[PDB]
Design a protein around this ligand. Structure first.
Ligand SMILES: Nc1ncnc2c1ncn2[C@@H]1O[C@H](COP(=O)(O)OP(=O)(O)O)[C@@H](O)[C@H]1O
Ligand SMILES: NC(=[NH2+])NCCC[C@H](N)C(=O)O
Ligand SMILES: [Mg+2]
Length: 356
């Protein structure tokens, strides 16, 4: 590695050490021992430890703080990724391997809130990376366009309920983009954690969103991951939402070659999205349990769930509406992932009803 990067790396390590109240997994697991063992390493694509931890160093408020510039990074800088992946996903040893794709018995999934007084909307998303293309930090403006064309073309073949239209971000009016974001359909623009990881270069080139007219099935093109396949709708009908997702993913995979790893399952940009790459969530109101957010988050964590704001991660809840989802994605099947959300949410609703 060049000495400039080495100097930047030494500076970053010091910044992490000096940040006493920093609670990121990067700071926690990047011991001097680990640091020294991989700071001089570089991947075939020229990715260094700096490309990996840069976001965490610049954004000390990061929960994780690292990203994989390319697939090789997960192993080249394994001494750092491994303990962090093990920590975040609730246990994943060096000898562990992510299980084969398994949607499970969808008929065992249920309506999460029949009376409809708590859940506002249910959503399930997956992420996929195109074989042949590296993660954001190593992509050229031309590659973004290539990927956009391949994906949009493929999605033009979607039929029936999944039939839709691709809407490029480039050329999209400001009003439409903002409405799509406010409506919780489109990804947000200008994420500080992604920017510092150099994952937003050439924006908004090659970026866009595909969605059926109903906006129940959507596909994000070139945001954090090459693709984010989404299924969502008002209410708490998890069975229908999940089934739609399964249908879409199965079909898209028969057309597009996605990167899958023997140990990490489906590959993604952030280590938190590996394996199933699944995040099943609900926008829900729990006034009693939410009153003291400490207890809300403490209760959720026991069910392996994560709490996010109404507009997504790093945001606050608006009007008492929280985003609650399964935190774990690696080391468990797609079925187990969606089940953790279903099981936890059903219980949290029971607790809310019984709360004083
Ligand atoms: N159950 C839900 N209902 C409606 N919108 C949701 C729901 N869950 C997440 N979202 C929306 O998904 C968008 C992306 O949020 P984010 O936290 O980045 O999740 P991810 O990238 O994993 O999909 C946001 O606009 C957020 O409001
Ligand atoms: N990957 C993702 N969208 N969210 C989890 C990590 C977010 C950010 N890097 C951090 O807080 O570390
Ligand atoms: Mg996101």
């Amino acid at each position: 590695v060049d000495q400039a990067t080495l100097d930047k790396l030494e500076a970053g390590f010091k910044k992490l050490q000096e940040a006493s109240d920093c609670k990121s997994l990067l700071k926690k697991h990047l011991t001097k021992d680990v640091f020294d063992s991989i700071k001089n390493k570089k991947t075939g694509m020229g990715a260094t430890l700096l490309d990996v931890i840069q976001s965490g160093v610049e954004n000390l408020d990061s929960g994780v703080g690292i990203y994989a510039p390319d697939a090789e990074s997960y192993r080249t800088f394994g001494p750092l990724f491994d303990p962090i992946i093990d920590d975040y996903h609730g246990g994943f040893k060096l000898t562990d391997k992510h299980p084969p794709k398994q949607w499970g018995d969808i008929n065992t999934l249920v309506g999460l809130d029949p009376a409809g007084q708590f859940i506002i909307s249910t959503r399930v998303r997956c992420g996929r990376s195109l074989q042949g293309y590296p993660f954001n930090p190593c992509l050229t403006a031309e590659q973004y366009k290539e990927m956009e064309e391949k994906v949009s073309s493929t999605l033009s073949s979607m039929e029936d309920e999944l039939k839709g239209t691709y809407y490029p971000l480039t050329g999209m009016s400001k009003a439409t983009q903002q409405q799509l974001i406010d409506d919780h359909f489109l990804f947000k623009e200008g994420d500080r954690f992604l920017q510092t990881a150099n994952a937003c270069r050439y924006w908004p080139t090659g970026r866009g969103i595909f969605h059926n007219d109903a906006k129940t099935f959507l596909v994000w093109v070139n945001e954090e991951d090459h693709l984010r396949i989404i299924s969502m709708q008002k209410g708490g009908d998890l069975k229908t939402v999940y089934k739609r997702l399964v249908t879409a993913v199965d079909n898209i995979e028969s057309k597009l070659p996605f990167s899958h790893d023997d140990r990490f399952g489906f590959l993604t940009f952030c280590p938190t999205n590996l394996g199933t790459t699944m995040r099943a969530s609900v926008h829900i109101q729990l006034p009693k349990l939410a009153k003291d957010r400490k207890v809300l988050e403490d209760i959720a964590s026991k069910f392996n769930l994560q709490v996010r704001g109404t507009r997504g991660e790093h945001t606050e809840s608006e009007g008492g509406v929280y985003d609650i989802s399964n935190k774990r994605r690696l080391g468990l099947t797609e079925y187990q992932a969606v089940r953790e959300m279903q099981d936890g949410i059903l219980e949290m609703i029971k607790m809310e009803k019984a709360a004083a």
